[PDB]
Amino acid sequence: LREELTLESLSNVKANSYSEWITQPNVSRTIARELKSFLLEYTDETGRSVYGARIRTLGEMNSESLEVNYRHLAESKAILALFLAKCPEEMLKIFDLVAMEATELHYPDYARIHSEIHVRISDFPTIYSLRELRESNLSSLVRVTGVVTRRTGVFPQLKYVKTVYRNYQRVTLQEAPGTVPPGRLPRHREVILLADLVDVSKPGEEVEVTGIYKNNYDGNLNAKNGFPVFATIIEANSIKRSWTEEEEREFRKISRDRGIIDKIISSMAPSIYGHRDIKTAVACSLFGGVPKNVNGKHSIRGDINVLLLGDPGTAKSQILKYVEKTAHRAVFAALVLADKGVCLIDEFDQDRTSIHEAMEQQSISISKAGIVTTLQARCSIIAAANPNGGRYNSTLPLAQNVSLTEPILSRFDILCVVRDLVDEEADERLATFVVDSHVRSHPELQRQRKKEEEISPIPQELLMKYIHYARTKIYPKLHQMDMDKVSRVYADLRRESISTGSFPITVRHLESILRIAESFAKMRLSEFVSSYDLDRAIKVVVDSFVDAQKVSVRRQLRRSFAIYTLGH
Amino acid sequence: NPKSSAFFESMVEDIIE
Amino acid sequence: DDDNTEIIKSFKNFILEFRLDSQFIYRDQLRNNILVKNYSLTVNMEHLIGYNEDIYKKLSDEPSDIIPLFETAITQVAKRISILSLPTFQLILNSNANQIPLRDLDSEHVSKIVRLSGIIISTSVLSSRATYLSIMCRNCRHTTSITINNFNVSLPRSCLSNCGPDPYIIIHESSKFIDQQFLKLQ
Amino acid sequence: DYYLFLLRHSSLYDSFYYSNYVNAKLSLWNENGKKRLHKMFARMGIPLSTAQETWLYMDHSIKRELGIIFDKNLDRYGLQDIIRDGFVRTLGYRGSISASEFVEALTALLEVGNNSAQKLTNLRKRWVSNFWLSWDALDDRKVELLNRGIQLAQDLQRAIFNTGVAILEKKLIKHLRIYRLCVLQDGPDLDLYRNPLTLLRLGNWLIECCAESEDKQLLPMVLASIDENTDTYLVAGLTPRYPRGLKKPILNNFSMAFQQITAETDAKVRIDNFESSIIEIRREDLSPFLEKLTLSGLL
Ligand SMILES: Nc1ncnc2c1ncn2[C@@H]1O[C@H](COP(=O)(O)OP(=O)(O)NP(=O)(O)O)[C@@H](O)[C@H]1O
Numbered sequence A: 001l002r003e004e005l006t007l008e009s010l011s012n013v014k015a016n017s018y019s020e021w022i023t024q025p026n027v028s029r030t031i032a033r034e035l036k037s038f039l040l041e042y043t044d045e046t047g048r049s050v051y052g053a054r055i056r057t058l059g060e061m062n063s064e065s066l067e068v069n070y071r072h073l074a075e076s077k078a079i080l081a082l083f084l085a086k087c088p089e090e091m092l093k094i095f096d097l098v099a100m101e102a103t104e105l106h107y108p109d110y111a112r113i114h115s116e117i118h119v120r121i122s123d124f125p126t127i128y129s130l131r132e133l134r135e136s137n138l139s140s141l142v143r144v145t146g147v148v149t150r151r152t153g154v155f156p157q158l159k160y161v162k163t164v165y166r167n168y169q170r171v172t173l174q175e176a177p178g179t180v181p182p183g184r185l186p187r188h189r190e191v192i193l194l195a196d197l198v199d200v201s202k203p204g205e206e207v208e209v210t211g212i213y214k215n216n217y218d219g220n221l222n223a224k225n226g227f228p229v230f231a232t233i234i235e236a237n238s239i240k241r242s243w244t245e246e247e248e249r250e251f252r253k254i255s256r257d258r259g260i261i262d263k264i265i266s267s268m269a270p271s272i273y274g275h276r277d278i279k280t281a282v283a284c285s286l287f288g289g290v291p292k293n294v295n296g297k298h299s300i301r302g303d304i305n306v307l308l309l310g311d312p313g314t315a316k317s318q319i320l321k322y323v324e325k326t327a328h329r330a331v332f333a334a335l336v337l338a339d340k341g342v343c344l345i346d347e348f349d350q351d352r353t354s355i356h357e358a359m360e361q362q363s364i365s366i367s368k369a370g371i372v373t374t375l376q377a378r379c380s381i382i383a384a385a386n387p388n389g390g391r392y393n394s395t396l397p398l399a400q401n402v403s404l405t406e407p408i409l410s411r412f413d414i415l416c417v418v419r420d421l422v423d424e425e426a427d428e429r430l431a432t433f434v435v436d437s438h439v440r441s442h443p444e445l446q447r448q449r450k451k452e453e454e455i456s457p458i459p460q461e462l463l464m465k466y467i468h469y470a471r472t473k474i475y476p477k478l479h480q481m482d483m484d485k486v487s488r489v490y491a492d493l494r495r496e497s498i499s500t501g502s503f504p505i506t507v508r509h510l511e512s513i514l515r516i517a518e519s520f521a522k523m524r525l526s527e528f529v530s531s532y533d534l535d536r537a538i539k540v541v542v543d544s545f546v547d548a549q550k551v552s553v554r555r556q557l558r559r560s561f562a563i564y565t566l567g568h
Numbered sequence B: 001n002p003k004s005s006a007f008f009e010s011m012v013e014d015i016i017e
Numbered sequence C: 001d002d003d004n005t006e007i008i009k010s011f012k013n014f015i016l017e018f019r020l021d022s023q024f025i026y027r028d029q030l031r032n033n034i035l036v037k038n039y040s041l042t043v044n045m046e047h048l049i050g051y052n053e054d055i056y057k058k059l060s061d062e063p064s065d066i067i068p069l070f071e072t073a074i075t076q077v078a079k080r081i082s083i084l085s086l087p088t089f090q091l092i093l094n095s096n097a098n099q100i101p102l103r104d105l106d107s108e109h110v111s112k113i114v115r116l117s118g119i120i121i122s123t124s125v126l127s128s129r130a131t132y133l134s135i136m137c138r139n140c141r142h143t144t145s146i147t148i149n150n151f152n153v154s155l156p157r158s159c160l161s162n163c164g165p166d167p168y169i170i171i172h173e174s175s176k177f178i179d180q181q182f183l184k185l186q
Numbered sequence D: 001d002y003y004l005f006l007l008r009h010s011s012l013y014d015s016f017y018y019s020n021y022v023n024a025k026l027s028l029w030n031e032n033g034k035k036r037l038h039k040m041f042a043r044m045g046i047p048l049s050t051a052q053e054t055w056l057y058m059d060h061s062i063k064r065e066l067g068i069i070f071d072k073n074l075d076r077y078g079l080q081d082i083i084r085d086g087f088v089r090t091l092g093y094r095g096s097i098s099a100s101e102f103v104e105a106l107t108a109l110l111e112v113g114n115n116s117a118q119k120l121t122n123l124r125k126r127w128v129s130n131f132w133l134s135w136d137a138l139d140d141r142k143v144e145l146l147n148r149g150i151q152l153a154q155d156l157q158r159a160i161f162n163t164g165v166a167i168l169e170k171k172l173i174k175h176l177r178i179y180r181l182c183v184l185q186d187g188p189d190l191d192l193y194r195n196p197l198t199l200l201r202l203g204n205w206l207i208e209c210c211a212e213s214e215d216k217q218l219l220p221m222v223l224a225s226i227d228e229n230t231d232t233y234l235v236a237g238l239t240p241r242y243p244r245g246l247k248k249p250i251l252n253n254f255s256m257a258f259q260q261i262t263a264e265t266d267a268k269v270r271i272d273n274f275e276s277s278i279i280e281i282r283r284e285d286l287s288p289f290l291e292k293l294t295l296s297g298l299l
């Protein structure tokens, strides 16, 4: 009762099993005292007691979970780490009852904020996939990784069997495809999430889990299999999956340099040779303009939509994969998952109908058996297609080469056609680059640095951070001086289009020009659109408009439009 | 106790800062 | 036992006495509702808090138990101002407390008054619930009755007038019912 | 009564957050201040989600225990000056109000209630109607108008705070040797500072910040704001003042200085306000006026 053991006395487990040794009163009191002495005393090399700092921030956020690193607990008082690995279900009870004392030492009357605190363990030093688990692991702490396949809704659950409740949720976990051996199906397990951990993860995420491995009797399993076979579940204890001023100053430094736009475009899709215009359009779409709206029933996208007609094998799928890896959030082929992200289409009636509604609106609506509901799309669409069989025909307008309605071509911001042209020098350049990249990728630190810096002019990590920063921070505006010139150019383009008998230019083209100019301003972190932005946007839209036309109309347009497509 | 002084220092820094 | 009477007395005195400037607003509302055959009362939380905070504290701690007592107090007041028969009146509330987003409701809020908002997406057809209900005892052919109220019941088994283990059946021929409906909020 | 901005309306958290004294004491314009407020509420034993509830609906137990909770905790944050005594009035069942809240409601109603010479005449005429919109609120029969006044007061303080943070973070205060200068060339909506009273509220905010930021150099301050319709700056000269808890009073000397420069200056200026410490001057003439002012020994 009164007397206590030494830490050296705990070196000898004296009972017949671990659990029957931890649960004894004197042993338990000794463990409680030692854990409290560890929590109040552990230090960084700089002093600077980490857990005093963490308990301080626990109250700053009104939180409920204290986090403890396993390596720290193993660095001193190792036997407690061993006992924790062997008997988590007891050790964590004692540890939580110590953590409440430690937190009340900082914040007296924190019991009125939350009645109970949970300790979360981190950096457990051994890992299994869902293959290696065996019966020996039962009731032991384990660390597991996989993809979350399915998720239930959150419910309350009775805590004690006056009443109290807690939150509850179950998650299905599956082996990551990269880990599965060849020629085998993936395995599955199910995880139980309790009070603080519910809705920590979403379906499709790749997740890492620490918890107890546990089992129970099930009548149906025994009935169907005909052997005394128990079912097993994992009870999670913890689950796992910004910038400084220095980054901001570096961004501003590179943006202050001339030609940053060209360098960003050059960095786009390093592995793919040529096709600069496609890279330009993709970069413009990834940055985008600013979404705007006007009472009196008008609205303007920030998102820039792009469509690309590819001859067979002209690098379309590779750039789409590159954009998938580059972009923050995206969908590859479901518009709900693309919210404020990029939507990617590589090939192509109900799907087209859905896309018609998606391009017409920015929100999707549906009804079923009396139910009515609405959803948001709010995304940039990049699409690619094969031009009506084996090969594009340049003698004909765009409509002959596609299976699309006119409003699709009307509502997309940028349209372009890519073709496998014949040239000895271009072929030699392509072949040399291809074999050079092939050798550079062969499986057989300095090598990586040389390889990286030769690959691109900008480190793509910095570019991705730059894109995220620009998208979150920069929101450019037009300057009112030169817009008289833009109106005159618009009128002139309409007049010339009518004069040759072309399909006319429209307000959609003007709106796209302004939005693309905002994107050019955003790319250099400029809050002001400038004359050169408008010039570049005009060139892009006019060239795209010219590419859609028949050959004679094309020649007349380019002869007249020379002061826009080339000059300004 | 001197060994646990860092913990209380982290506590007391809220008073100081 | 006495606590059920004091609470009803307190709410009865609340309805009969709350003036703001010169008009007994709730006596007037309760009279004006009866003339158009509307049996309900729309109380405002802030006025209840202003009158006596203890009553609001009791209401806030245990709503499921205390709402019926206030309803029967409304009936007892309703009879005095209009008779020298009426059903039980429905209480309706208005409040300005902070809205909880629908996504944040969890186990801490069970059996608490909650204010939220959203979009209605579906509506059920009407269905019947019982309030006053009559009972026939199968063996002895004795009869009795029960009064239901719709707050969070089953048929009893204490046989009366041996009389058997489960002798009770319902006389639907002499019972009273009300409407009920289900909705979905998104 | 507590020197907390409208305690008995809105919420306790907003009462601390927008208090003019608390901003100076804990530096709420940056995250390292706001975390102190979160830390205080954590130590006091008040759940942070209840601190943000409307003060009428906040739980009765916290209401009655608040008077003792402050005695144990405000010392650790150097914030003992919050406690004081004041007057409170109540009528029937409609709830209490203190004078300190009443005057804020009245001033809000004065401020926001609903070529060059004609526009100035229209503006000054509009400002006169608010006198009657406040006069009618001194009657117990018209509490409805007083509630509207309180609703306007909250928005006014919100807008003032959102401008003060922008002034401090961008470091627009220019530290001249003799006095501190600040000029607002642009803002989210600079029209609110065209009225004198709103401008003086912003000045009082900045004066508390400057008073507590450093022990040294109690200096006069000058604050100005442009108007795009007149192309004139509205200028005000403000004194320092000593902290609350601490002996003759000081005197504002900007009146004689502005009068002398006005008598001397080529500049196109106006002086007709009863408080002579506030003047107006055209866009191009601000810099020569201030140059002659700082050259003068009258400051
Ligand atoms: N610089 C390059 N230019 C063209 N092709 C390249 C280049 N680098 C690699 N390739 C290869 O050429 C193809 C690029 O075009 P891509 O569209 O991805 O092929 P594909 O998808 O099979 N053709 P398709 O089915 O019509 O989309 C791939 O097979 C690449 O391996």
Ligand SMILES: [Mg+2]
Pocket: A313, A315, A316, A317, A318
């Ligand atoms: Mg392809």
Ligand SMILES: [Zn+2]
Pocket: C137, C139, C140, C141, C142, C159, C160, C161, C163
């Ligand atoms: Zn019987």
